[PDB]
């Protein structure tokens, strides 16, 4: 499963001026196999089907 990662508030996880690899690390903690900065937010690939990703409808911020 792929999608943008959300932070603790349901916002997209920013990667503005973050080091390269930051999104891969954050996707990896959530059990994703790959991630990249889809500037300005992190995008993950390989997440199990049960992990929740960002959605336009209940997006806040």
UniProtKB/Swiss-Prot annotation:
Keywords, in A-Z order: Amidation, Antimicrobial, Disulfide bond, Fungicide, Ion channel impairing toxin, Neurotoxin, Secreted, Signal, Toxin, Voltage-gated sodium channel impairing toxin
pH dependence: Optimum pH is 4.5-7.5. Is almost completely inactivated at pH 11.5.
Disulphide linkage map: 11-61, 15-37, 23-42, 27-44
Post-translational modification as stated in the protein's UniProt record: C-terminal amidation is important for high activity.
GO-annotated molecular function: sodium channel inhibitor activity; toxin activity
Temperature curve summary: Optimum temperature is 25-60 degrees Celsius. All temperatures tested are optimal.
GO (cellular component) term, any one: extracellular region
Key word Disulfide bond present: yes
Tissue expression profile of the protein: Expressed by the venom gland.
UniProt-annotated location(s): Secreted
Gene Ontology biological-process annotations: defense response to fungus; killing of cells of another organism
PTM-bearing positions, type Cysteine amide: 61
Sites marked Important for activity: 12, 39, 54
Domain LCN-type CS-alpha/beta stretches: 1-61
Family of this protein: Belongs to the long (4 C-C) scorpion toxin superfamily. Sodium channel inhibitor family.
Comment on protein domains: Has the structural arrangement of an alpha-helix connected to antiparallel beta-sheets by disulfide bonds (CS-alpha/beta).
Additional notes on this entry: Is the main neurotoxin of the venom of T.serrulatus.
Function: Voltage-gated sodium channels (Nav) gating-modifier. Acts both as alpha- and beta-toxin, since it affects not only activation but also inactivation of Nav channels. Binds to Nav domain DII and impairs the four Nav channel voltage sensors movements. Depending on Nav channel subtypes tested, can also bind Nav domains DIII (low affinity) and DIV (very low affinity). Acts on almost all the Nav channels tested (mammalian Nav1.2/SCN2A, Nav1.3/SCN3A, Nav1.4/SCN4A, Nav1.5/SCN5A, Nav1.6/SCN8A, Nav1.9/SCN11A, and insect DmNav1). Is highly active against both mammals and insects.
Name this polypeptide is given: Beta-mammal/insect toxin Ts1
Organism: Tityus serrulatus
Organism placement in taxonomy: Eukaryota, Metazoa, Ecdysozoa, Arthropoda, Chelicerata
Residues of the full protein shown: 21 to 81 of 84
């Amino acid at each position: 499963k792929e999608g943008y990662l959300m932070d603790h508030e349901g916002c997209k996880l920013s990667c503005f001026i973050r080091p390269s690899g930051y999104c891969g690390r954050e996707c990896g903690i959530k059990k994703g196999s790959s991630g990249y900065c889809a500037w300005p937010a992190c995008y993950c690939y390989g997440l199990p089907n049960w992990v929740k990703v960002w959605d336009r409808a209940t997006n806040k911020c």
